[PDB]
Design a protein around this ligand. Structure first.
Ligand code: CDL
Ligand code: PLX
Ligand code: PEE
Ligand code: 8Q1
Lengths: 459, 98, 80, 178, 56, 128, 124, 88, 55, 67
């Protein structure tokens, strides 16, 4: 695993010793090479995980996450070099350093064998994100949003630490292999109930769970393009990965303690999907769609069936790619009109044909059009929930009906109709934007041919 | 009732300008200055795809069991089998209500 | 192209239902000043039109003739 | 569409609009031309029966009763011209209308073709540029100090002058742009 | 191998060929609609054969 | 004389059928003139910027910013905890949760009770 | 249907119920009923792949029709006599069903009338 | 293909042809500059019918606010030319 | 502006015309019997569609 | 082919369109007549509907109300 960790660290001196007009090129090229190297982790086994050493290991659940994390950095660099043109060289290098540190922390987090090191890196991921949001954001809200991002997470994650150090005092270890092999059932007591709550809410805040989701429409909207991209694509999947890892010790209490969270998620799907229908802000619409998608992953993890686990992993990967592409598409129009209002700029299909095509493909993948992996994950989760309870099909289908409603609506208001008359500064799309769109969308379609690579360890 | 003199005059000026602009939307004879077999359709669009599909089905798809499953051929009395040479007996002396 | 309008004086309501309309207003005390403008809808090839049953049996004569000759040929050929 | 609206419609305007609307719905009900002519002459007589009524109270009451009659007897599916707001080809070609300023973003290679058109476009752009200040001055002189009472715009009252705010009216793309 | 399966699969696969040519220099010419119509006609003619085998 | 047309929320009253357009007083005409004056002044202000050759960008509309700010950022400062607001929030945010909890808990208890007695016909139920 | 009018409007207990029919023993009035004969046994019907609906007492004619259709494929207007024979067999089966319906109707009408007459003869 | 490129002369001929059909207007006294009220003595309800006749003739609808202002055949011809983007 | 004398339209409509004339007879006679026909029907019920249509 | 608008006159027609329309109408009518003459049973039926009242009580096994 050090064969990917060390080049990521080496990206820092390379960026800091590069010329004032060569940082972007070197960073993009070497991040792409690192992603190519990380692609080798997809060769997973069928029985046990890839135990590289005492510190790091790779499983069929974390390999696609690592690949997506490594692939995301070149896209962030491509998207971030437009609005940072007037910036000074030192601040550009600081921004690239923040991105590289975030990627390094994410790679270390997705492969830590011990739960305490996983928690340490999972909490360390907050500093670069908060710095990016509160320093390179555009509006005055970027301060407040940062606080909302900083304290929602910690208030959930601080009890988890108290739980983790407690577990090692009773079982003797926090290594995931020993934890799994020496797993014991959880009794139904108040102490065990609060231990269950401590280990779960830290990740429920990150997903986020409906009710603890208010930080997301602020943080994602107020952050710059790369910040929102990394927040939606990867940072939201930390909660799902941690829940998948930690739910082993919570059995069989998860049978009884999952009811409030399942109810919250299944009603929050409908609630957020309906909220997306009336949204004057496009970026907020995408952010709320992200929560509506993550509620499904929460339900899938809670019901605890192999089909649900595979569907949740596939949905996580697909949603990360789709949300990143949608945020890029929104930022493309924002960089022209300098406003996030969805009805301000209309009829863009007449002026930007290929970007309209990109919008159409992103919207099609957003509403889970088969045979896209979004549909695979959603359908696996829905089938597992139907096995859990048939009445679930009432809500899930409803969500689907709403999901297509607010997606094509977003496609119709911005792309169709007649162009607004007074706007006359719409320039043709640059090759950088189209290349970013293509690099977002091509792997999404390519993953359909080999879905087993993103179906998790239950496959 | 009717146009006011100023309204009418402004209409004439706008009409003249619009007519001139529409006349200006016309192209010169040189205007698009561009810068510097009998049955070949059926062989590259039918023959090639059918060759590829026949090869793929005969030598790759059929190499695995149950990949290509056929409905059992219908057998009627008096028929002859090509595999074993068996003959099926006739259908039991019709009452012949003719 | 290079085709001009016909004479405006040829449009008469004579022989058309517009005449029945003109008498029906005249019996009430009013006049129809736009009758001539519609006259072209009854003037040329629009003067006569087929009925519904006539429309349904558009090609009955030729098809019936073909049917009878075919039947007569086949019946007499069958008597070998 | 082209004329500036007024503060209100007078009685004459309202009754004329009602007459036209009732005639259109009558034509929708009376499909054939002779029957429509008969009943349209009858409707014209019915309107003319109160042509010279001078008491405005009774006139307004009759107009109200006629409006109720029209609303009760209107065609549920009246005929609409295809390009009219309710028609089947209302905004059909709005997707093919492209604003002229997009031509400013064309590549030099694209502008290599149609050189005469772009020379004429440069002529038009300079003509627009050289007359803007005069138009602004004329608008600032003619308008009352409080502000415009009506959206009507003035013509060019000098010789080498263009009517103020003319560029977007004159440079309309087309009704059949492609 | 009997030609039923091959002909049935070819009927569907030859419809996708003009889609593969949507970026070629036939999509920017005015002969594309006629090309698609000819492809559909050829597909119908090919599909007529498995139908004959079934009726047999 | 004719069946009267009564308006509704989703089918409003027509412009020809409202009494307000048939009972006219001079202050009504004055109000209409003032409305026209405001509309015309706004139209002239927009058209001065729209037709300008030097302008490049977007004509910023204060009304749109006001609409967005009222819909998003001005709601909490104008919120007061009132019996109507409290009851509506409690209902619309609490009732669905316990309703669905009761429904699913009842269904799952029924299913588990059927399973324990061994009467569900779970044959061929391999995948779950 | 007329039977529907008689049943739904008149006395419903005088005419058969299609779901519950026949209710009388098959040998109640007939002195000797012979078993209905079938030509094609189970094996030929299974080989011919006839549908479960088509496997009725007219299956042999259907088998002959299918055989002659398969043999004379290009000229599809030769299977007229065989189709006629199969259709005649189906028509005869339908008339048999109608005969059964009429028999049950008359037997049901006779039974209740006979018992009511016996009761009337027991009035005093 | 589609309809021919209708021009100014065509529109003027159609308008005068429709007007000459009308019984009320004398064909000889009618001219392209003839005002509907002063020169021919028609009322407002009659101008509405003339506007409707032109609407039917050219197959498009003129708004009432625009319709009321038209009082000469030349005015109607110019309005139709502006609507149809006819420059000859 | 009535003008239908274009070979594309005429051929396209004519092909489906021949289809809608002869396809029922062609197809009905080559498919094998998929059901049991209704051989015995009352005369007033065999003709019910036709009188309903003409009425 | 090149025909022109005619402005309130019957539009110009060509021989081929009239002959094709007449030919196809006659073909349809001949098909109907031919099929009626050869396949009448498809419309008029082939087997008569038996009348249940014409069946004797012995044909349906009915005892004469005494046994
Ligand atoms: C099934 C078809 C088989 C095709 C054969 C193989 C084709 C391979 C294509 C691979 C994907 C294309 C790459 C995506 C980016 C597009 C590139 C581009 O910018 O266009 C510029 C280019 C230049 O033209 P232009 O004039 O400059 O246009 C400029 C404007 O942008 C104007 O642009 P526009 O207005 O012309 O719009 C672009 C166009 C095309 O652009 C697109 O939108 C493509 C995206 C379509 C769906 C993707 C999102 C939806 C989620 C479904 C996930 C499917 C993934 C499948 C695996 C993909 C493998 C890479 O949009 C459409 O035509 C409508 C798209 C909606 C399709 C809905 C049907 C979905 C289900 C169909 C079945 C899927 C499974 C097949 C197998 C099933 C069992 C047999 O245009 C093209 O060349 C068209 C692209 C190719 C057409 C694709 C249509 C269907 C593809 C379905 C998936 C392919 C499966 C292949 C396996 C074999 C089967
Ligand atoms: C906006 C969204 C925020 C996130 C929401 C998080 C959801 C957390 C909910 C936790 C799930 C249940 C917690 C405790 C389990 C049982 C709860 C209770 O209602 O059940 C009864 C518990 O009995 C009594 O009701 C005790 C609970 C009474 C006191 C709790 C206060 C409830 C008020 C609601 C609090 C709001 C939650 C969020 C706070 C911010 C069962 O009866 P009993 O058989 O005897 O107990 C079984 C447990 N044993 C075996 C250990 C003994
Ligand atoms: C963004 C907001 C998210 C908020 C998340 C925070 C809620 C987490 C749940 C409460 C955390 C407390 C658990 C801490 C670790 C417990 C591990 C454990 O098992 O120890 C228990 C101790 O359990 C406790 O003491 C927990 C009591 C709670 C103290 C803190 C109260 C915080 C609020 C509690 C109720 C609310 C919880 C859910 C709220 C949802 C958030 C809105 C037993 O230890 P022993 O000494 O060995 O006893 C057995 C031998 N005799
Ligand atoms: C299908 C249809 C449904 C039913 C439709 C119902 C329609 C009801 C018809 C009855 C209408 C009336 O009573 S008519 C309305 C009754 N009130 C008056 O007539 C007031 C006096 N109006 C004038 O004097 C005008 O000037 C004028 C006469 C226009 C001359 O104007 P011109 O100077 O320009 O010629």
């Amino acid at each position: 695993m050090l064969k990917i960790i060390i080049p990521t660290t080496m990206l820092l001196p390379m960026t800091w010793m590069s010329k004032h007009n060569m940082i972007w090129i070197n960073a993009t090229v070497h991040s792409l090479l690192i992603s190519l190297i990380s692609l080798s982790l997809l060769n997973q086994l069928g029985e046990n995980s890839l135990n590289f050493s005492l510190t790091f290991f790779s499983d069929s659940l974390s390999a696609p996450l690592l690949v997506l994390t490594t692939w995301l950095l070149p896209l962030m660099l491509m998207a971030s070099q437009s609005h940072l043109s007037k910036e000074t060289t030192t601040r550009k290098k600081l921004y690239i350093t923040m991105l590289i540190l975030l990627q390094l922390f994410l790679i270390m987090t997705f492969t830590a064998t011990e739960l305490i090191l996983f928690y340490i890196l999972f909490e360390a991921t907050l500093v670069p994100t908060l710095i990016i949001i509160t320093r390179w954001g555009n509006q005055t809200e970027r301060l407040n949003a940062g606080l909302y991002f900083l304290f929602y997470t910690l208030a959930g994650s601080l009890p988890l630490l108290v739980a983790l150090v407690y577990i090692q005092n009773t079982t003797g270890s926090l290594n995931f292999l020993i934890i799994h092999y020496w797993s014991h059932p959880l009794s139904n007591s108040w102490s065990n109930i609060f231990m269950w709550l401590a280990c779960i809410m830290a990740f429920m805040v990150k997903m986020p769970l409906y009710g603890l989701h208010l930080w997301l429409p602020k943080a994602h909207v107020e952050a710059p393009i790369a910040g929102s991209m990394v927040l939606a694509a990867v940072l939201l999947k930390l909660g799902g990965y941690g829940m998948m890892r930690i739910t082993t010790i919570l059995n069989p209490l998860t049978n009884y303690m999952a009811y409030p969270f399942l109810m919250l998620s299944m009603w929050g799907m409908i609630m957020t999907s309906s909220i997306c229908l009336r949204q004057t802000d496009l970026k907020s619409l995408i952010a709320y769609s992200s929560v509506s998608h993550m509620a499904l992953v929460i339900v899938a993890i809670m019901i605890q069936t192999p089909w649900s686990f595979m569907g949740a992993t596939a949905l996580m990967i697909a949603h990360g790619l789709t949300s990143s592409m949608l945020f890029c598409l929104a930022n493309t129009n924002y960089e022209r009109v300098h406003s996030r209002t969805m009805i301000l700029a209309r009829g863009l299909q007449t002026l930007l044909p290929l970007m309209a095509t990109w919008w159409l493909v992103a919207s099609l993948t957003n509403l889970a059009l088969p045979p896209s992996i979004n549909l695979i994950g959603e359908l696996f989760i829905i089938t597992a929930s139907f096995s859990w309870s048939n009445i679930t099909i009432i809500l899930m289908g409803m969500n689907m009906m709403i999901t297509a409603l607010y997606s094509l609506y977003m496609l119709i208001t911005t792309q169709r109709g007649k162009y607004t008359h007074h706007i006359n500064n719409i320039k043709p799309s640059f090759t950088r934007e189209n290349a970013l769109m293509a690099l977002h969308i091509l792997p999404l379609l390519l993953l359909t041919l080999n879905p087993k690579m993103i179906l998790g360890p239950l496959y | 009732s009717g146009y006011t003199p100023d309204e009418k005059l402004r209409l004439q000026q706008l009409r003249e300008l619009r007519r001139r602009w529409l006349k200006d939307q016309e192209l010169s004879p040189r205007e698009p200055v561009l810068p510097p077999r009998h049955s070949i359709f059926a062989v590259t669009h039918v023959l090639i795809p059918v060759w590829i599909i026949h090869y793929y089905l005969k030598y790759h798809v059929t190499a695995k069991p149950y990949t290509v499953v056929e409905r059992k051929p219908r057998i009627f009395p008096g028929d002859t089998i090509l595999e074993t040479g068996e003959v099926i007996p006739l259908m039991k002396e019709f009452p012949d209500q003719h | 192209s290079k085709m001009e309008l016909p004479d405006y004086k040829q449009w008469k309501i004579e022989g058309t239902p517009l005449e029945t309309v003109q008498e029906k207003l005249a019996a009430r005390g009013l006049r129809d000043p736009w009758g001539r403008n519609e006259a072209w809808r009854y003037s040329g090839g629009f003067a006569n039109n087929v009925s519904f049953v006539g429309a349904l049996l558009k090609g009955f004569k030729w098809g019936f003739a073909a049917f009878v000759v075919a039947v007569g040929a086949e019946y007499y050929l069958e008597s070998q | 569409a082209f004329s500036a609206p007024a503060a209100y419609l007078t009685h004459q305007q309202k009754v004329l609009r009602l007459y036209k609307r009732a005639l259109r719905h009558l034509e929708s009900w009376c499909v054939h031309r002779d029957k429509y002519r008969y009943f349209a002459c009858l409707m014209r007589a019915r309107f003319d029966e109160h042509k010279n009524e001078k008491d405005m109270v009774k006139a307004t009451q009759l107009l109200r009763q006629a409006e109720e009659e029209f609303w009760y007897g209107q065609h549920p599916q009246p005929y609409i011209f295809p390009e009219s707001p309710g028609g089947t080809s209302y905004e059909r070609y709005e997707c093919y209308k492209v604003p002229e300023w997009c031509l400013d973003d064309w590549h030099p290679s694209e502008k290599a073709m149609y050189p005469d058109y772009f020379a004429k476009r440069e002529q038009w752009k300079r003509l627009r540029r050289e007359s803007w200040e005069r138009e602004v001055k004329q608008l600032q002189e003619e308008t009352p100090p409080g502000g415009p009472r009506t959206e009507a715009l003035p013509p060019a009252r000098k010789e080498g002058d263009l009517p103020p705010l003319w560029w977007h009216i004159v440079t309309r793309p087309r009704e059949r742009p492609m | 191998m009997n030609p039923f399966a091959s002909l049935t699969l070819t009927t569907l696969t030859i419809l996708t060929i003009p889609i593969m040519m949507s970026n070629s220099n036939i999509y920017k010419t005015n002969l594309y609609p006629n090309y698609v119509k000819t492809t559909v006609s050829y597909a119908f003619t090919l599909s007529l054969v498995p139908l004959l085998m079934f009726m047999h | 004389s004719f069946p009267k047309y009564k308006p509704s929320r989703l089918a409003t009253l027509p412009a020809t059928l409202d009494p307000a357009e048939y009972d006219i007083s001079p202050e009504t005409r004055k109000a209409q003139a003032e409305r026209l004056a405001i509309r015309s002044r706004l139209k002239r202000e927009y058209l001065l910027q729209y037709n300008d050759p030097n302008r490049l960008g977007v004509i910023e509309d204060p009304a749109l910013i006001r609409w967005t700010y009222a819909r998003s950022a001005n709601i909490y400062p104008n919120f007061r905890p009132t019996p109507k607001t409290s009851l509506l929030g409690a209902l619309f945010g609490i009732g669905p949760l316990f309703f669905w909890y009761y429904v699913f808990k009842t269904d799952r208890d029924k299913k588990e009770k059927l399973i324990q007695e061994g009467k569900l016909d779970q044959t061929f139920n391999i995948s779950y | 249907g007329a039977h529907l009018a008689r049943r739904y409007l008149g006395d419903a207990s005088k005419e058969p119920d299609p779901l519950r029919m026949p209710t009388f023993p098959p040998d109640y009035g007939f002195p000797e009923r012979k078993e209905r004969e079938m030509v094609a046994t189970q094996q030929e019907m299974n080989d011919a792949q006839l549908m479960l609906q088509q496997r009725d007492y007219c299956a042999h004619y259907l088998i002959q029709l299918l055989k002659c259709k398969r043999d004379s494929f290009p000229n599809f207007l030769a299977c007229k006599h065989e189709q006629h024979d199969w259709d005649y067999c189906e028509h005869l089966d339908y008339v048999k069903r109608m005969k059964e319906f009429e028999r049950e109707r008359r037997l049901l009408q006779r039974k209740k009338r006979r018992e009511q007459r016996e009761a009337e003869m027991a009035r005093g | 293909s589609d309809a021919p490129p209708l021009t100014l002369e065509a529109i003027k001929d159609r308008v005068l042809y429709v007007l000459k059909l009308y019984d009320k207007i004398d064909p000889e006294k009618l001219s392209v500059n003839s005002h509907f009220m002063k020169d021919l003595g028609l009322d407002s309800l009659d101008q509405v019918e003339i506007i409707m006749a032109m609407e039917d003739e050219f197959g498009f609808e003129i708004p009432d606010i625009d319709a009321e202002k038209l009082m000469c055949p030349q005015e109607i011809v110019d309005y139709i030319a502006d609507k149809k983007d006819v420059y000859e | 502006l009535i003008n239908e004398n274009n070979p594309l339209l005429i051929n396209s409509i004519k092909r489906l015309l021949i289809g809608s004339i002869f396809a029922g007879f062609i197809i009905s006679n080559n498919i094998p019997p998929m059901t049991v026909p209704n051989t015995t029907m009352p005369l007033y019920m065999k003709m019910t569609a036709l009188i309903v249509t003409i009425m | 082919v090149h025909i022109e608008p005619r402005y309130r006159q019957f539009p110009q027609l060509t021989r081929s369109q009239l002959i094709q329309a007449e030919f196809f109408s006659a073909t349809m009518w001949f098909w109907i007549l031919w099929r009626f003459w050869h396949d009448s049973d498809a419309v008029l039926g082939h087997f008569p509907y038996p009348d249940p009242s014409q069946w004797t009580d012995e044909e349906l096994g009915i005892l004469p109300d005494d046994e």
